[model samples]
Target chain A: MLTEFDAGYGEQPFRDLCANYPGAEAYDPHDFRIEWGPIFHRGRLDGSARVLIVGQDPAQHETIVRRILVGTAGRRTQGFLAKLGIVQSYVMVNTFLYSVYGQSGGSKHKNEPGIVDYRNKWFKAVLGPGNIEAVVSLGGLADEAWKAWLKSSDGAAYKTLAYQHITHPTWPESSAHDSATQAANTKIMLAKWNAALAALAPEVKHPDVPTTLVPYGDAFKPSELVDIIAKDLPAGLPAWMRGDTPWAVRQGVDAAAKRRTIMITIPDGVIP
Target chain B: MLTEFDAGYGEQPFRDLCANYPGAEAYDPHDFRIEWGPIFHRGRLDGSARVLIVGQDPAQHETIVRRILVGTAGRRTQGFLAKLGIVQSYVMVNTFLYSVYGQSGGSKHKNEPGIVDYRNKWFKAVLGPGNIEAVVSLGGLADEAWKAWLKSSDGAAYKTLAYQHITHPTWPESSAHDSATQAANTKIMLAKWNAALAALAPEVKHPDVPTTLVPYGDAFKPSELVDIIAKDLPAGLPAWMRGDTPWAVRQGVDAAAKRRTIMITIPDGVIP
Candidate 1:
């Protein structure tokens, strides 16, 4: 039985998309599950607004169990949406109903066949028609997978999947050079994606986000008290900025000795 | 030798405080350096009306090369003060002059005596007397140490140390307590601290900060996703409010997976 969940697209287009889909074999059916997570729709779901968003698999295990599709990394995605004013206007959904991985698996490891089916079904049944003007494929696999699906199925009035390389936040340090280059490329692609969005929805004007969300040194540093303090510092070459200068020298003689220490402890033999 | 450095105090009080603290200890008569790095008054030396912030110490080794009395930590402290609407009215300084353990010993360790002496002397000469109206200590040691100094010094009249618990953003587990009695005691202390601050500065008021900042259960519970996606959460249940949850989950997950993972290696063999 195909139990209807709140896909949030409502009637008309949802019905049209569902009726035209090729079949279930295109996606892994075992992963299909009813998704009841929040739906973010820009303007009215029924309105004639072309939309585009990169879809990742559901990431939270609880949401997966509930058969709710959620973006892989919610906070970062949310922050970006808020920055772009898309949170109020755009609709974001995960490609899969269930998270690819469970609680045991960390964020990067993708799994679960049934989820792939649900996402495939949803896209073919609901979003794939003329509604989506452009899609920014966030990562390599996603881009390849979506393009393969598109080529196989539809060649009607042109819509495109824009392959945008977004640097995985958890890039291996051994591949640091690749990550840096990829990040630069990702920046360029993101700019293109933004331009596409502007072209699609000329009414929704957004200011260009600063190229540098964080400075190079600031972005790479671990979030520690020292690091946080450093962020507040103005670019300089002074006593406080210089090495070999004592904190006591900075604080002053009397108050320095009695300063409270905020030391983060590590497990046995783990030097911080 | 006057080197170009950034030194600003917004008002006369802060300027006076800096002027008073002018000397540094000399180890070698031939090569003399100031005993401390830098000291500022209640206001900016440049005359900007920024808030006053009081923190424990300058972060060592990571951000800057010099052990200047002033630091980037001062700026973060200023940020928190700004959030509390005190940045413009308040001046921030640390109790210590140098990193506690010395350059080689590293900043994460506790501060040592020679550094403390240098800091205490600077404070006594400058920001002390009746110049300071209130003192906001970040943690336990800062409160105790400041009291000890106040008892010994001539600056006792206007000294008001508001011993509020550390911000949840800082030492998340500092207030962790299991027993109800202990928790209640902590709550009482926190209430008293808030009441005292309100009493001292009628112009400034603050919401009731909880006595304990740590949250129960795992910090990064994948299970929380269902509720987060389904409906709005209670005011205090967001990720940031669940103080100890993330820290606990981070440890728990790492401990469970320590020996099992092959392809991916945890950094420092631990989750942060």
Candidate 2:
């Protein structure tokens, strides 16, 4: 009783890619938390994807889930996709496989040839089918990632693809220290998100649901938060992972210890 | 980008279990590939689940995906759940954490206390919410697994729960040597499956779809086969892992080598 549905990269390419993935050679152990291993992209890998998302990198939550997104930023992005009526017809990848170990680890290696070259292979594979109608980059790094692709020989083909670089989903949390400031930044982020949503909605001519565009308010509504679908994750992950509360984070007293540790707490009230 | 949905167990419980998991001490490496680590249950661990499923064991597909089921058997069971309109309201756990290394490994350790006791912990956790209305067992082993629980003190409370034991989804494939025989066996299996469906339909009074029960044909019809929903899987898994085709199987020169190796082939047409 299996339905005819596309899952992801099958045997050959997936094997080769996983075997030859960039390890400590590209990602420095001292600078990045390379011990956690590299987490790959989330969402469809087949040609069914109509929209391609370029995220910055993995985080504590992403590390545990082994997906690029599934934290505060991912849920908001899911809402953004719903506005475009693109439910299951989307693919997402990150600029880096592992989380940026420190504040400058991301910026320092933003233009590393080894990193860009490998990431370009992914972009080419995902965009090769020519099914993507709209492209969205989460933040400045992703925007740069797209721009770098344009300079590449393969990226030249996708130069004409409709694209937008919106504020990262967790930008509000990252850029502010105080709750009031975070709230204000969230409002500012939503306004910009609304603008991006308007531009991408029409470009995404092919949506899974074909729904009317609904822009986000000044803040995220309870309903706007969407769960990451089962199709997007590695098999056997529990549903609480995609839940709204924060379940994973790096924990340690020192930098090295923290780098090696990821603390995950199941959400409260789940056990009856 | 986390959503507000329920992910699975929090940090404490998960860590305790992962660290103390029974490995070679309980499961034999010669028969069961204990080296791959334990592949846990698939589906909801939160209190939201309504249907509880007890499966026989993990397989090649489950080993790679780190989830129980998700192979041909999983897809078939997904269709069965659809008949009861219990789309996203179910949880499934296997009789064993790892795949049955050989034919006899399952039967040989059928009454192993180490295995049964650990599995019972999962049953208690999933059923602790007291929301489950129906319990299903796949094949005779799973039936015994459920029966074993009934003998336990915690399971005594679930004695009143609606229960059904159905033929394993892959029984035809495993029982027959030829296509004609396999096809004939499938018909026989479906007849019995239809009978189980009829009996379980009324017990599932609260269905997500609220549709009338529809029995399977002599063989699976196109409409009868449904895709496993995203909610049922862990986060970040690609859709291909849950598709209809068999992409994973144990392979090697002999029994020993085969037990140690699992060959995964990506489904055709995913590269482009």
Candidate 3:
């Protein structure tokens, strides 16, 4: 029997959106990983999507899968949706199409009208159906992305919709130098995430599962970091691409080499 | 303006074929790079294709682009199509869905029914329209692939169609230890390709451009190795992916490491 898979942007509006996507003219080459190419959204482009998640940018994992939020940030975000009883009824898009090379790249270009304008088109596409009952934004940049959309002519219509911006799934790791600090940071981030989850839970009018809303503890439990669902990926991608273990990394001798390279390892159990 | 692109298998029998593709059960994981996932094809599948191409397998570049024959072999193949005046009206599929890991892996599995049956499905889908006037196979294995299809119940209908098997595109690099020998082998390969060009030229009744047949030199001219057309790629992929210079390679410390890794370097001129 054929399993259900997400066939990317083949339909009308999406087809036009992908075909006319903005390139380096809007997102500067020095800041964004434009060379790696664009990684678009993940999850339902169909009207089935009930909760919309706005993410940061593409990382090594995202580059290979060609879908944003397929790595650590993705998994944690997946769990967040599950807490609202949304298993496969969520959609995700990044603040930027490509990975931000440095912090400045993100902040410097956050308000650029060209970048913001293109992103608004996507926001309008998904939000157009009006099936989306709630919205969640990960990290500060994504929060800015959502707000920027709200300011756009097309995006302004969704202003009163329920929305929450939480700490990015990888913030703990990025903000800490030591494991202890990382653990401490995770606790703080989770508390803020828990609060966000509580606020959005009731607003998620439609859920993939009709169930209780479970809040997160001080830190993410092993079960809390969910695997990215199959329906979120492009057609024919193996489970390992969205599995619990990390399988892709940037590797090279120097900055130029590293910028130009990504190493993918098939996770152990999945190969056989 | 929205540029044209291959939307992949979003329609009909192809969607089912991709959704239920034969996996490690049929194509053993030990002999194939199945972990990198399956790369279906490149070029027209809209039944507008006047020519059909059969390639050997996926390589590093193919894995990234999720399309077969996008690397050295692909560029060379693109040139061959251009010579036939088939700039964009061709359909290509591989003999094997995954990259053959070693020599025996290929020879060993050439006639596996599970593999052959699935490939035949693609043949039937493309040839069903009867617009394809000629067929070309890149290497010996592809030659066998064509024959295998000829033997199939559905494929037997095209037994009288024009068919030619040329040398594999990367045979020079694979067969030679030094540059001089590589050059000499290139001469031999191009001559055989010239013969193939002669055979297929008349069979191609619908060329993108009306032209007289021009034979290849002892070696490939710079212009002869054409860039992969934008329409051949998935929606929104940049020009660099199908550009002339190489952008991907496999690098590792050992066999297992190599099996697990692919390094993608965006070719120099692309980054703006």
- How does each model score on TM-score? 0.27, 0.54, 0.96
- The candidate, 1 or 3, that scores higher on TM-score is 3
- What's model 1's lDDT at B225? 19
Candidate 1 local lDDT, A1-272, one digit each (tens): 11111222225554333223322233232232112122222122443333344455433222211111122233233334333434323334444333232223323323334334434554554354445444444445455445545654443223343324343322233134676775665455445434533443332343233222321222322221121111112212122221211211111133322111111112222111
Q: Clashing residue pairs, candidate 3?
A: none
Q: Between the candidate structures 2 and 3, which one is better when assessed by TM-score?
A: 3
How high is the DockQ of candidate 3? 0.63
Q: For residues A27-91, could you state the per-residue lDDT of candidate 3 as single tens digits? A: 88888888876778999988899988998888988888888888898888888888888899878
- Provide the DockQ value for model 1: 0.02
Candidate 2 segments whose C-alpha is farther than 4 A from its true place: A1-8, B1-272
DockQ-wise, the better of 1 and 2 is: 2
Q: B-chain TM-score, every candidate?
A: 0.41, 0.92, 0.97
lDDT of 2: 0.75
Name the weakest run of 10 consecutive residues (lDDT summed) in model 1 chain B: B227-236
The best-first sequence of candidates by DockQ reads 3, 2, 1
lDDT of 2 by residue, B1-272 (tens): 22112233333344345435565567776666555556777777657788999998877777656667787788888888998998888889888887776655678877777788888888887888788989999999999989989999999998889999999898998997899999999999989988888888888877888978777788888667776665554434445566776766665577655554554554654322
Off by over 4 Å in 3: none
The models' CA-based lDDT, in order, is 0.33, 0.75, 0.85
